Amino acid sequence: DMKLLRYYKNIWLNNKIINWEISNPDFLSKYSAITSSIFQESFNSVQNLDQLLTDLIETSFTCFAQFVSNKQYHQANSNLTLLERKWVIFITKHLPLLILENSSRSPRVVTNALDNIDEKVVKAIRIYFTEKDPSTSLDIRHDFIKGLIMLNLQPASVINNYLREDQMIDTSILPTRDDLFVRNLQGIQEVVHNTNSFIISSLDTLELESITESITHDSSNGLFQVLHNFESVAPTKQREIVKAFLSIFEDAIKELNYNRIAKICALLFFNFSHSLTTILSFSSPAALMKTLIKFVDLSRNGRNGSNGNDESSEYETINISLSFSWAILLIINLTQTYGISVVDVALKYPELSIKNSFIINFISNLPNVSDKYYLEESNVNDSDMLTKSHNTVQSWLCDLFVNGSITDQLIQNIETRQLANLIPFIVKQVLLSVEIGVLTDISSLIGGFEYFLQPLLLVGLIKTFYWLEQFLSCVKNDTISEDILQGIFNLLNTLFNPVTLNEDSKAFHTAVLRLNAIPLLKVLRKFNLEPLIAKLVAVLNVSPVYDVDPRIINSENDYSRKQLGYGKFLILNENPINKIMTNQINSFWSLHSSTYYNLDYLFELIELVTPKSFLFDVLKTLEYKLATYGVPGSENKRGSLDSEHVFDYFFYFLVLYDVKTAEEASQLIEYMENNKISILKRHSFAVLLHERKLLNDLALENGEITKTENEKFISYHDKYLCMLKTCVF
């Protein structure tokens, strides 16, 4: 009963932390109703607020303990750290606020909560830190108490209670006020009394050149200092800062202010000191996606009311081009590393035109470019546009490779969407021609590729880098002479190492090289070679990269006698898929091993084996273990109630992998009782169970299946519904 409660609560917290639902004001209500939902019988106990906060404290600490103490059994390079940073952010940011506006400011309850923990967590944390590395080794408990001090929750005499008996902390040194302090140009810590005004004032005077070249922290801009010093922000103030961006960003879309839109996207993309991760920790990524995709979709109507007959048009067109081009880079970074799908948001919001959405089909075909150039895709049945489609290709090739200048007429007559596909087409044709031997002059091309770096033509580089590895992978296996190979690097180095960069293109060029750097580095090392890796490692070191082996980035001289793994999930012959899933069967059945409570290592494992084979190889294999060994935890093989709770562990886990939000549960109950519902959950178990339920019922009318077999299958189905309806999601 207690074990059931703790398992259910740990998996519930893990799922809710993954699902970005911390910002939901229903967190405490669901956490309180967990106890009543788990026990079918009525449990009418008045749980006081201190009890709720204490339960949250030990639940979070034990969950983090298991999360960090299950990592040694993983592969040493099966690196997934998004959830680790997510735990850190939650425990250091939200729980202090949960106490701040949920607690009664009782110092005793905090002492009881942090004194009731086992020493196993402390021993494991210290052992892991020592193995990774006396040097200052602070734990997550110190950061928890420090945040409470800034909120006036506890006096400065409380931190000394939990400190080691030999080392104290000076009370005066610890910050005690929640006011923003920034180092000015003269070194005085200035008080930022107003947050929104500070952002807009700095944003207006912000320079796009100061993004990546300003390695030093002594920058005159206050806002840029905050990004590199993001780890020390006050607990309550960062919520205001995150909310400040949202209100400012939504207003910029309404007013069509192109200057501030492009600058904002540059800060968020690079993710200095885990700046972008905290953003998704607060504001739901769905709402952020909706406004962001509205701009990229509704921008079509904005080009029919502007006439290029003013000297500010070239300023505006560059401002328009960069505002649109940067907004694309924000989506790709979110989709690739942060695990968000563009298709899902369109289904949830009916106001998005799926069939007429250019963004939706662009991302899914990002690494692949069409061999033919089409001005419009929905009207391929017409030939009038195809006549001038070839005209555009020859017009741009002659002007950029022979004339050496870009006429203003070409830019005005073409849209950004055609440019996003025109640039990959031309570079592919030139690069392919060079490789075969059609093009033999390099020097004219080196200057030619310089024109792709102008602010007007910046959006055309997004698809250029993705195609490179597919181009390079064939090159790696194919036999290419060094004379051609050194030429390929010469043409490539022009895009990689420009001689000069404009004040609006230097940060953009680094940003695009950061999206698809990792697979490029692996292919390049398989072979003027060093500068490309040197440039690639330089742009990889500007900010941390998630789920990457640090040995790969700095493998210049380190030789640890262990082969590098470039992927999130890695498998060897010594530890094949059999051993891990046999250890999963030992955990799916007897809850052995230590790979559980790790949805990083399990969700990817499910996909690699597919939900069908994952469920098929465990459901029917359970009987063999059950028929011989028996139900663990009971010394008597009497009754099926003991085995009933064991089945609840397996079915409750599958529910969370299917249901992700609150209102979604109320709609899946109607799916079972019988269009838009199953669209979002193509790979869910619920679809697989329901599609077989209706199909075998059809055979029941025709009588090709025994009645006993049909009764067995519905037993699994009704159990899934029964827990779905009795538990609130």
Partner: protein
Amino acid sequence: MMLGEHLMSWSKTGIIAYSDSQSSNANICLTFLESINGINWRFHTPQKYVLHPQLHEQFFYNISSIHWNNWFSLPGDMLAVCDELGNMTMLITGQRPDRATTYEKLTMVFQDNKIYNHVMPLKPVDKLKPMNIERKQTRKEYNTSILEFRWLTSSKSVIVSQFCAFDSSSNTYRSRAQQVPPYGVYHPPFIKYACLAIRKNGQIDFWYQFSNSKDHKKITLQLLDTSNQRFKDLQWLEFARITPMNDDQCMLITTYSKLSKNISFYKLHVNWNLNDPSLKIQFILSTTLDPTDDEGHVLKLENLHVVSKSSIEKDPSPEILVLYNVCDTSKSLVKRYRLAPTQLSYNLRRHSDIVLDKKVTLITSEMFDAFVSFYFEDGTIESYNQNDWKLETERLISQSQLGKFKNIIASPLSAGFNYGKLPLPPSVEWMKVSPSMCGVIVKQYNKKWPQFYAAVQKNYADPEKDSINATALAFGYVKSLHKQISAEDLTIAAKTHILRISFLDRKRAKEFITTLLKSLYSFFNISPDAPKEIMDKIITSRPLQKIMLLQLELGSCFSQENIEEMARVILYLKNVLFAFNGVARNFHFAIEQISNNSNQQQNPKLFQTIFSKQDLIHSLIPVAKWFVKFITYLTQEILILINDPTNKEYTLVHGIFGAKMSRTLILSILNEIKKVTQIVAKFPETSYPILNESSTFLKLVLSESPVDFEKFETFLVDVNNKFIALCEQQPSQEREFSLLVKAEIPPEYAKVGDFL
């Protein structure tokens, strides 16, 4: 869940080897079709066997896939089965270490775990003693789990037919056969055989055997030839379909790795030239799948089946049929892609999209037929041709009749013979359409025996469609013989339609047989109205062993009818032909061996040679008794028919004499009989008088026959001359068919019947 696409395999010789998952003592089963009482059919008794990795000297594992070597022009007897653990067990049938055996007895070649040679003849489980073997279930998908198995053909060429058209000028159907040169990868003659298997981890295997040795060799590689073993053991391929391409020694290993969520393409190269073949691999291309349709409905990849396309078709690029299902909608979309090189002034070019109204649960590609089968949920099957993706069962309705070539028919399915209400896939363990598409094999959970469903036609009351149907079934066998298929499935389907015809009008059904078998001769460019030179070629032809067998089964229900009797006597005369002339050639060579081997009489080899010379002639005596007993039956009917010429039940006597080659065939038998007796008289046995009994008995049985052979010899000779002058009197080609098959004389030639 996906069905068992490779759980069962119909061997080209009729053996149905399928996986067994219910018996606790066996994992494989063997059976075949047999006739109950000449009319009905039943499957043979299941011959159960047990396969475990330790047959070389104990728990056995489940069977993953069964692949008969029926590909291309291979003999189709060497069965190699791959278990769930990844061990490839090769079983050879029809051969024993010491002698030759029938097709229902198995034998091992080698076992893989390292590979070693161990020849051992397997025995059935039921006959074997109770052994200590339990069904251990390998519920783990190992690195060595073979995804797709493919066989390697030899350098031999295969000749098949593509289609037939109705020649309205002659009001007859015409077919053209085109030779198919080998394409893809073929193993040289000096290698006994070769095979390829792709494992789920990406590791590849290449088993081969040298024709001059018994030891087996294995060469293994891995697809992802990276410098790190971290990614070597990561390629968990969901689908790995190997389609040979027209490129020399190349196989397109179309794989879909969910790790990178892209349909990666590969190319495999092998250099045959006794050195071991060298294996090479080269990455080519990778693409991403489309998320949505045109109207805004998302898609999910259900299956990735690429068709094995030869160079015959207009665009030889293989069709990558990525199936998608629109969720909560009965529609199912099948997007088609083709791989083509990138041209200057590779890539995947999208041709079109095809929408199907029902969800698909299984896809099986037909062999040597170019037919993709869509096993929908409701049991209906819609086989789309590879050429145009036009439905075969509805092609006639939508065919543009006007043109030079009309009524293009490729299979009996084009006529309209649609399968009935098949059992629902949830209850079905596995399905497989029969090779001729005439019926479907269904294995049921509660049925201990395989079932069978045949094709039915709703408009059986319309008499005008008999002309098309007979021609459609005529071409069904034409492809089967060229592919050396038994085509027992097609025989059952033809009889059921004939039976329904005979229930209403018995007269109509008889004409259906005559028209049906006539089209076979036209299709194969063999003419029973040709001059006598071609007639000698007909007797030695294999098809008469099968085309005559057709009426042996299609005419069984007709009691007291001479349609089957006429075919059997000619067929048995062929067996009679193999008796005398089969040994007349053998006996002739024995004459020369006597003279040249007369210089060593005391050697221990001549004594056995001498004994065998006079023993062989002894075994011919029982055959000669039936030879004399046969000619008396026809002579007896002569006396009976004279008194009552109006008896229709004794019309078989007319056809026997009417057959043109039979009169010559018996004359040839009488000729060699005279030659043998003359040679025996010229060269009698003198060393051992006791051995002369067999030679003397041969002379006695001929002289003591109740009817003199010389008088009977002139009987058939005179019939030939009279039946030739009648052809010049009036030209007719149906009389040649009538005297050979119908065993009757047309009413327009009633005067000819009185002469006999």
